[PDB]
């Protein structure tokens, strides 16, 4: 009966993973009707594909082995191991690819998914000579050797690398659709680490100093948790299934420009106009320096030139003409500063 219970748990895990990832892939395919080859779609699609490979070659072998008393089948006997390890590498390499893409999204304006796939495939090639006939043994010391290799390549090294990349991501963010997608990738990383930490912890333990099925189950739960996190974050797939500091400086300088415009339009004489335009000049140069740069600084060139025209009119005693020249600043602001403010939805 306990064997049947283990069979039931494994079959349920297989169902959850295969169904969630197939549904996410179907939602992405349906979005494909709109030409939405968005960068995030291919990454999460191949992440779900990696979770599908995991489900098909981690749970199914386990199910077939729990039935009768071994994985009946030698070429396939080791091929299963190869594919399994392929999925084990991909389950973190796709997250690393996503974190790299989120880094890029706030940097200079597919290849990395194929890079992750190539790593997950090549780094599993030893499984085609480690395991061989009855059932397959990993004979050859070999325990700490391959255990350390697997624990580092699959879990520890990509965890620290992705941590460094996420620190770089906050580095560029700190210096908000991208922030939301960064948070999604962060939740994916956290779930991956929590699911897989005890697995390699005890593997290395046995490796240097000599009930695993519970850890296999908890680890495999990550490949069903990921797609639902993505569905929670991504509005398109959810529908189908049913910079910062520079921006703050820009906001401060634009608020200063607006307050100076308020001072100008209510001004009575040339002196207040000149003072407010002086503050306008300072604020506009400061904003022109900050990054949301060709059309940005060009728009601020126009703003400063209009401020200068208003200053020339004010110095000649033409207060009202200076006020009109300052009113042109509202037109320039609406033309350019609003577009630059729109960058806050990307952050």
């Amino acid at each position, epitope marked *: 009966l306990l064997a049947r219970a283990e069979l039931a748990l494994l079959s349920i895990v297989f169902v959850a993973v295969a169904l969630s990832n197939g549904l996410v892939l179907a939602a992405l395919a349906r979005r494909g009707r709109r030409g939405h080859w968005a960068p995030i779609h291919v990454f999460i699609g191949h992440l779900c594909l990696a979770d599908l490979a995991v489900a098909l070659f981690q749970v199914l072998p386990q199910l077939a082995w729990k039935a009768t008393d071994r994985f009946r089948g030698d070429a396939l006997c080791r091929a299963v191991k190869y594919l399994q390890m392929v999925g084990m590498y991909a389950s973190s390499y796709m997250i690393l690819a996503m974190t790299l893409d989120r880094h890029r999204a706030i940097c200079r304006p597919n290849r990395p998914v194929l890079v992750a796939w190539a790593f997950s495939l090549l780094l599993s090639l030893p499984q085609l000579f480690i395991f061989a006939q009855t059932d397959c043994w990993a004979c050859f010391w070999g325990r700490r050797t391959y255990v350390t290799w697997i624990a580092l390549m699959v879990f520890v090294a990509p965890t620290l690398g992705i941590a460094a990349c996420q620190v770089l991501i906050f580095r560029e963010i700190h210096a908000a659709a991208v922030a939301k997608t960064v948070r999604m990738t962060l939740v994916i990383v956290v779930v991956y680490v929590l699911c897989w930490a005890p697995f390699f912890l005890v593997q290395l333990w046995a490796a240097w100093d000599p009930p695993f099925v519970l850890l296999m189950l908890l680890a495999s739960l990550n490949s069903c948790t990921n797609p639902w996190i993505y569905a929670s974050f991504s509005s398109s797939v959810s529908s189908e299934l049913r910079a910062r500091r520079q921006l703050a400086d820009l906001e401060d300088n634009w608020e200063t420009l607006n307050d100076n415009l308020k001072v100008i339009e209510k001004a009575d004489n040339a002196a207040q106009v*000149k*003072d407010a335009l*002086t*503050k306008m*000049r*300072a604020a506009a*140069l*400061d904003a022109q*320096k900050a990054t949301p740069m060709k059309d940005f600084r060009h728009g601020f*060139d126009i703003l*400063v*030139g209009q401020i*200068d025209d208003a*200053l*020339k009119l004010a*110095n*000649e005693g033409k207060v009202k003409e200076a006020q009109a020249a300052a009113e042109q600043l509202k037109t320039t602001r609406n033309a350019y500063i609003q577009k630059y403010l729109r960058a806050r939805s990307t952050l």
Partner: antibody
Amino acid sequence: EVQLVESGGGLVQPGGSLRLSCAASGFNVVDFSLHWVRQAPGKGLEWVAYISSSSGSTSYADSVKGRFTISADTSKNTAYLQMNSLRAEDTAVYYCARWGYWPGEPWWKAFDYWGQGTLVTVSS
Amino acid sequence: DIQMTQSPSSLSASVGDRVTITCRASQSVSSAVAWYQQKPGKAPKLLIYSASSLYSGVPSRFSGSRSGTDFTLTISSLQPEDFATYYCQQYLYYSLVTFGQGTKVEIKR
């Protein structure tokens, strides 16, 4: 070669009517606004006035408003500062300086060229 | 409207010393501050513009710096040619030009 050459100084009475001439070479007075800056002997630099010979007005410091007048000639490529009702307090060395127009580097490189000083002495 | 203030009116240093002069603008101005070097009997010569940029032809040992309304001129290693007067100015607009009081670098003995 870019240069500013000031002339027309010397000794005048405390009644003014002294005209200083700043000739320009290399950079035309049309392309750059021209400023006169005053330095009393033993004292620091004090801005006096400026003119945009091609696109705008003339501005003066509060210390000289009502007395100094700046003009320019774009065909002689020169600028003039006329000082009336000069006082002994205005005895100083006067410098003619360039300043470019917004936008670009020419505006940021304020007073790239000062030419030379011309001494104006006001005493009875 | 905008006043420039300098504290180190008299700076005594020997050849090779690294020297620093400060200048504060009275308003929340942009990087429109400049540094000039003047020798007695000669017109001032531009050293620093944009409050951080080295003017073409100026020896590389000069360096400017901006922190809000405080601006700094440094000489990495004083030469005997650098014992002169130095001025800071605010050049926010043509009608707003104002200079500091000036600082003089003299030989430490």
